[PDB]
Design a protein around this ligand. Structure first.
Ligand SMILES: [Mg+2]
Ligand SMILES: [Mg+2]
Ligand SMILES: [Mg+2]
Ligand SMILES: [Mg+2]
Ligand SMILES: [Mg+2]
Ligand SMILES: [Mg+2]
Ligand SMILES: [Mg+2]
Ligand SMILES: [Mg+2]
Ligand SMILES: [Mg+2]
Ligand SMILES: [Mg+2]
Ligand SMILES: [Mg+2]
Ligand SMILES: [Mg+2]
Lengths: 82, 205, 80, 155, 129, 123
RNA sequence: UUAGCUAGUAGGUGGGGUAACGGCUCACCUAGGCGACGAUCCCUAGCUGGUCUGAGAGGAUGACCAGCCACACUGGAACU
RNA sequence: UACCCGCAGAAGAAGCACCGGCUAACUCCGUGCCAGCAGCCGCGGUAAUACGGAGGGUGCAAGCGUUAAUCGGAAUUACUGGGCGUAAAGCGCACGCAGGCGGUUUGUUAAGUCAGAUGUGAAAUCCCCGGGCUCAACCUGGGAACUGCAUCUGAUACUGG
């Protein structure tokens, strides 16, 4: 079960979710296949806090990977805003 | 995490004026400079090589009001930076807010600078800061709060700013009590009575 | 284009299989002196045409017994 | 104009029929700050007299050292009876990193950037000798160029 | 027995320099002639000449400058009991570029400075200073 | 030696020996005084050094030194011991910690009080 | 201041067995296999990225974080 | 909640170690080889800057000391980088298997050696250039590094066959 998920990094109260494709049975911050991008919920509004690698996501999704709900939301908002 | 004891004992121990006092009066009249503090301050024993290195280090720390842990971090930062360790260390010590506020003259000494900076009465680029050791980037604007504009001590220090020699790299406007950090000093503007070379081999034993 | 190793055979007493010793020079990790090690491998062989001491070409293959995982390819020494 | 400083002072003894006879020895190094450095050793009953004697002893027996820019031309290794000395040129601004006796010798000579370590015995009288030996045997590219008859395309 | 003839060559230059001999003589070999050629191109020796056919002998003419030996220190690095090989990016610089390191590479026996620009690297035969 | 000799037998490292084996990598160890007495130092010292034979929590019986002026360590008293040898006492390789467990601080002590377990005077 | 170790042991044929190669297993055949480049036996020990220190080489170390391994009161076993 | 504003008043907030030398910092009183101190040398038997107290000073500071443990200094297991006549250290002497090493020329091989490329060397960490918590620790983008392994192609001076 290959999934593209958010791994929570960063200090407390300042998450730095890390978009990465991984086997669903692994830990949230455990082993993963390959890092894809990042997402910063802080959203400082002075510099971009999200950059995703859409072509690798396509290579995974169209091959049989799975998108989580937050990552799916990230895909639609990046496309509409850029 | 500060110094609260007598001010001029520090100036006495290294035997030179350390600018701790406001300078409204002569330091000689206020205190006897040629004597060391304490009951043995009459005697001037032969100071060894380690002693002179330590006195240099303690002299810099007491000019800038910085403790040993803070100062050791500055030295490691200075040694990591490309260039030369001695004037890199001095350059960080200049970029502290206490020094920049004091040098631009809104505070008579670093202690007024410390109150002014730490009492939220200093803005940098319009942002309120109360950390004494916040580095000042070039092209940053430091101004007094509108509440703090009507206090006697700040205007009092402006005259003493003229009483002493003006810094070339800080541009002040006492009409509205503001200043600008054009860029860092190059160690040619700073006093030559500080031998920064001894600092390197003290911390590089 | 196939991965192959050189060696010389040390025994052929066991039947349909031989033991070959791969020699190599390796720098000593600490003292920097080129020492020589030995890799004795058990090698399967049909028709038993490998004697004693003759140089031999061997290739890795699927496991064929408890200890054997290498097979003959060619031989380059004969008749002592 | 030239600099002079004292390495060490030691009290020595010579017993006689009456008892001990105490004396004082002085090791000093004298350098112009360019690469012309010498050392003087003197003996006297009094410390001022002993140090003075070493002062004139150092003004004579001066040597010349070819410096690149406040530093050594190349790594150098100076050996005396019990003292081994390794000095190598360092980058600008790194200052002097050496033992007690070597730092004084090096700083009066005029080397500002150097990494120097002392092996073997650390007796001041012998490490100063070893340091002087290294500053001698270190060479300059132009003297090497004339030495090899190959001009100065090496650097 | 005799097990490092290259060490013998280096020892003869060193002892001849110390004793202020005009020339040294020693049985010749191809690697010996190559190292002598390197020294001659580099300016450490006056001239070498090979004589004889069945038993060749290198007659080296040593070099002096004022009252001092031209070769300050000559020593062997790669030895029969310890072979030393260095890559391109790890070739040593004897005396910060004012000395030479004889290097046997695929193209030929040559100095570190010339080997570093040819981009070869190889065995480190000798240090000459 | 020779490189070949060193490959055959590498450089054996010097094994370090602790000065306080009964502590066994513990900063302090609790024990009970199995004998409390005074002993004379080796020359050129002369005194009545206060020491105690203590059996530790790991079964190591060892003598320890009672620092300071005045102690109330009777027999069977449970205390804490720490490293540190008394030079003029052969075998006394440990110091008793004052101010911990049953051992009491030195009275009328105004300097180096933390080294003797003396609370700050109420002044 | 551990010198010999090995009898399914080393290999071959054939049957069986496993998701899969294999003495994995059994019957037979040959007498082999490992070892001074340290087998066997004894003590200690989870391994690594890394961490600490050191100019470097190196020395110590494997707590937190991540990868792998192994265990689940002790010993053994299979079932789904 | 961070954060911002208003209030009142210096008001609620400094301790620890050390001062014989190594090592920065000295005098007095007590005591009198006792009490004690001590990391090393050592100090104390009537002027103790070394013990205990007190003034003075020094270092660090919401910490300061002590103990334990690791590396360093220790070139004091020396690969880099040590020694063996007398300081520790050349077997009493020799023969000799394994092993280590090997004169000189040509050819060939390409195992060591060297060059190039390719694939790997997880992320975090360490380092460089930046970014965000008001600074800092902290978090974080990219890069460098991980030059170690494996494969393919090539060179043949040296070593080996
Ligand atoms: Mg703090
Ligand atoms: Mg079978
Ligand atoms: Mg265990
Ligand atoms: Mg070291
Ligand atoms: Mg070491
Ligand atoms: Mg020795
Ligand atoms: Mg003897
Ligand atoms: Mg002897
Ligand atoms: Mg003999
Ligand atoms: Mg040969
Ligand atoms: Mg090859
Ligand atoms: Mg990595």
């Amino acid at each position: 079960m290959v999934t593209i998920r958010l791994a929570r990094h960063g200090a407390k109260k300042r998450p730095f979710y890390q978009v990465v494709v991984a086997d669903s049975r692994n830990a949230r911050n455990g082993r993963f296949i390959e890092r894809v991008g990042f997402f910063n919920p802080i959203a400082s509004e002075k510099e971009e806090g999200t950059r995703l690698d859409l072509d690798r996501i396509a290579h995974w999704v169209g091959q049989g990977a799975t998108i989580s709900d937050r990552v799916a939301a990230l895909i639609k908002e990046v496309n509409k805003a850029a | 995490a500060r110094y609260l004891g007598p001010k001029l004992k520090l100036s006495r121990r290294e035997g030179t004026d350390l600018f701790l006092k406001s300078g409204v009066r002569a330091i000689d009249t206020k205190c006897k400079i040629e004597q060391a503090p304490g009951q043995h301050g009459a005697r001037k024993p032969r100071l060894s090589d380690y002693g002179v290195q330590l006195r240099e280090k303690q002299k810099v720390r007491r000019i800038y009001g910085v403790l040993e842990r803070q100062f050791r971090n500055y030295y490691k930062e200075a040694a990591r930076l490309k260039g030369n360790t001695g004037e890199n260390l001095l350059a960080l010590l200049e970029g502290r807010l206490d020094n920049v506020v004091y040098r631009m003259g809104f505070g008579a000494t670093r202690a007024e600078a410390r109150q002014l900076v730490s009492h939220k009465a200093i803005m940098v680029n319009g942002r309120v800061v109360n950390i004494a050791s916040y580095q000042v980037s070039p092209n940053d604007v430091v101004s007094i709060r509108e509440k703090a504009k009507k206090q006697s001590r700040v205007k009092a220090a402006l005259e003493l700013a003229e009483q002493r020699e003006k810094p070339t790299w800080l541009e002040v406007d006492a009409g509205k009590m503001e200043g600008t950090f054009k860029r860092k000093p190059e160690r040619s503007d700073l006093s030559a009575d500080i031998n920064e070379h001894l600092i390197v081999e003290l911390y590089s034993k | 284009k196939i991965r192959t190793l050189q060696g010389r055979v040390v025994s052929d007493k066991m039947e349909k299989s031989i033991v070959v010793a791969i020699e190599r020079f390796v720098k000593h990790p600490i003292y920097g002196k080129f020492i020589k090690r030995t890799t004795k491998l058990h090698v399967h062989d049909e028709n038993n045409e490998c004697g004693i001491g003759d140089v031999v070409e061997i290739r890795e293959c699927r496991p064929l017994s408890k200890t054997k995982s290498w097979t003959l390819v060619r031989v380059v020494e004969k008749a002592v | 104009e030239l600099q002079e400083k004292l390495i060490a002072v030691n009290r020595v003894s010579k017993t006689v029929k009456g008892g001990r006879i105490f004396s004082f020895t002085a090791l000093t190094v004298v350098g112009d700050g360019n690469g012309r450095v010498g050392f003087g050793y003197g003996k006297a009953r009094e410390v001022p007299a002993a140090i003075q004697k070493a002062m004139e002893k150092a003004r004579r027996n001066m040597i010349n050292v070819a410096l690149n820019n406040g530093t050594l031309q190349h790594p150098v290794k100076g050996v005396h009876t019990g003292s081994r000395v390794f000095m190598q040129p360092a980058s600008e601004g790194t200052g002097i990193i050496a033992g007690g006796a070597m730092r004084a010798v090096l700083e009066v000579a005029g080397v500002h950037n150097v990494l120097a370590k002392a092996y073997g015995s650390t007796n001041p009288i012998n490490v100063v000798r070893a340091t002087i030996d290294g500053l001698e045997n270190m060479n300059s590219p132009e003297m090497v160029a004339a030495k090899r008859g190959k001009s100065v395309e090496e650097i | 027995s005799m097990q490092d003839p290259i060490a013998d060559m280096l020892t003869r230059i060193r002892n001849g320099q110390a004793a202020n001999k005009a020339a040294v003589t020693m049985p010749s070999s191809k690697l010996k002639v190559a190292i002598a050629n390197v020294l001659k191109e580099e300016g450490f020796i006056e001239d070498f000449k090979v004589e004889g056919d069945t038993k060749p002998e290198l007659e080296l003419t040593l070099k002096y400058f004022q009252g001092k030996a031209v070769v300050e220190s000559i020593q062997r690095v790669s030895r029969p009991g310890l072979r030393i090989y260095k890559r391109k990016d790890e070739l040593p610089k004897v005396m910060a570029g004012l000395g030479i390191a004889v290097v046997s590479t695929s193209k030929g026996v040559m100095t570190d400075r010339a080997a570093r620009q040819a981009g070869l690297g190889g065995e480190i035969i000798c240090y000459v200073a | 030696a020779t490189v070949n000799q060193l490959v055959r037998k590498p450089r054996a490292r010097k094994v370090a020996k602790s000065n306080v084996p009964a502590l066994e990598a513990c900063p302090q160890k609790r024990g009970v005084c199995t004998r409390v007495y005074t002993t004379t130092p080796k020359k050129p010292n002369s005194a009545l050094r206060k020491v105690c034979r203590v059996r530790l929590t790991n079964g190591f019986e060892v003598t320890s030194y009672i620092g300071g002026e005045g102690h109330n360590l009777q027999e069977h008293s449970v205390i804490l011991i720490r490293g540190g040898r008394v030079k003029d006492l052969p075998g006394v390789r440990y110091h008793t910690v004052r101010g911990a467990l049953d051992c009491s601080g030195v009275k009328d002590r105004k300097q180096a009080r933390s080294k003797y377990g003396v609370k700050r005077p109420k002044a």
